[PDB]
Write a protein that binds this ligand. Structure first.
Ligand code: DXC
Length: 392
């Protein structure tokens, strides 16, 4: 009725779509420089790829979850994977940057599907301990894809063009898609229910008014932004800005990332020894020194990219520790539905990220490299403020 040990070929179809989606950001960003030095506009449009790719996610975010309830889980999930493979290749026929966004944004809306419909079909079919192994894997995906995507994204620009990636994914999404064609047993018990959408944001306005949740979502939104600012701009920061090569550049991704995960290995090993509340304040020191250090560094010295990247590691480590923990408490900051609390915190996080990245954009151009790190501190500051309230 629920689980066994034989239909494990289906979750890997979901986990593979999860994989191919993140790298859709975590490889293209370095290679966007080649996409920028071809479409003709400027290096300012490098990060602005990630941005439109994000802003898509939070679009149907809130709708697809209840929508996948009203009209099945199988067809909603399929329409998404199709939509992805479709847009993964139809992008190679745009050939201009004012409408490079358009399709980048369309692949962006193909992100809610993984959580809104996909993740639910595991909290509906498979049992507790069965799901636990599945999710801790899904956890690793969203950390390895950004960790090891940029390395393959740095070789792939040296050994191939940028067009090679867009196919490779539509392939990797169809790899699991033809694995999902006849192996996706839906679990939606709301078929034959009204198209109630004009009063759907009512179940949303309840969490949207929670003086504790909102703060805790923004505590989360901001705290992590600096990470994705780098992820968005490190191509330019380094290859152009600092004047470096794809080895000396792709070198700098890992120390950040390797420390990030060092924050997860220890988190998993001290979730036992220590309480949740403690862990966030326990991770709220390395960060606070990271975004201290990153900027304290680019004060008089404007080009010391080593110690900035070294800042974003102290920075990086603590994020492993904090974020995750704080996620728990932001969910249970509201005594409501998992899905809607989730729908909110995500439809917030991105606003923070999408916009966050744009404000981080000009910050670099105009201000140089200094301002950038200060508009990193801000959010350290920002986050920390939210904490002085949150726990006490
Ligand atoms: C919204 C899903 C929920 C599905 C799941 O539980 O796996 C979660 C799970 C993994 C999460 C991502 C992990 C990688 C990133 C870690 C950063 O420190 C914060 C932003 C990112 C980009 C996270 C954003 C978001 O919070 C995700 C995508």
């Amino acid at each position: 009725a629920r689980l066994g040990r034989q239909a494990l070929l289906f979750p890997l179809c979901l986990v593979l779509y999860e994989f191919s989606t993140y790298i859709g950001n975590d490889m293209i960003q370095p290679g966007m420089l080649a996409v920028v030095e071809q479409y003709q506009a400027g290096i300012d449009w490098v990060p602005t790829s990630m941005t439109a790719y994000l802003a898509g996610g939070m679009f149907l975010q809130w709708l697809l979850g209840p929508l996948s309830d009203r009209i099945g889980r199988r067809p909603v999930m399929l329409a998404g994977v199709v939509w992805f493979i479709v847009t993964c290749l139809a992008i190679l026929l745009a050939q201009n940057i004012e409408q490079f966004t358009l399709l980048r944004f369309l692949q962006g809306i193909s992100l809610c599907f993984i959580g809104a419909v996909g993740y639910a079909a595991i909290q509906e079919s498979f049992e507790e301990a069965v799901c636990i192994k599945i999710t801790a894997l899904m956890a690793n995906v969203a950390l390895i894809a950004p960790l090891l995507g940029p390395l393959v994204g740095a070789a792939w620009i040296h050994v191939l063009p940028w067009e090679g990636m867009f196919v490779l994914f539509a392939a990797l999404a169809a790899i699991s898609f033809f694995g999902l064609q006849r192996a996706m047993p839906e679990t939606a018990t709301r078929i034959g229910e009204k198209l109630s959408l004009k009063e759907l944001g009512r179940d949303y306005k309840l969490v949207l008014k929670n003086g504790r949740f909102v703060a805790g979502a923004l505590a989360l939104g901001f705290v992590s932004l600096p990470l994705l600012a780098w992820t968005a701009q490190s191509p330019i920061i380094i290859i152009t800005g600092e004047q470096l090569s794809s080895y000396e550049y792709g070198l700098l991704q890992v120390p950040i990332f390797g420390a990030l995960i060092a924050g997860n290995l220890l988190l998993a090993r001290l979730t036992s020894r220590r309480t949740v509340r403690s862990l966030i304040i326990m991770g709220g020191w390395p960060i606070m020194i990271g975004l201290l250090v990153a900027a304290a560094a680019t004060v008089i010295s404007s080009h010391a990219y080593l110690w900035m990247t070294a800042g974003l590691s102290i920075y990086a480590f603590g994020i492993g520790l904090a974020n995750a923990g704080l996620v728990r408490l932001t969910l249970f900051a509201s005594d409501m539905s998992k899905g809607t609390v989730s729908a909110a915190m995500e439809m917030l996080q991105m606003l923070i990220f999408t916009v966050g990245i744009e404000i981080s954009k000009h910050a670099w151009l105009n201000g140089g490299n200094g301002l950038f790190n200060l508009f990193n501190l801000v959010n350290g500051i920002l986050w920390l403020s939210l904490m002085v309230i949150f726990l006490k």
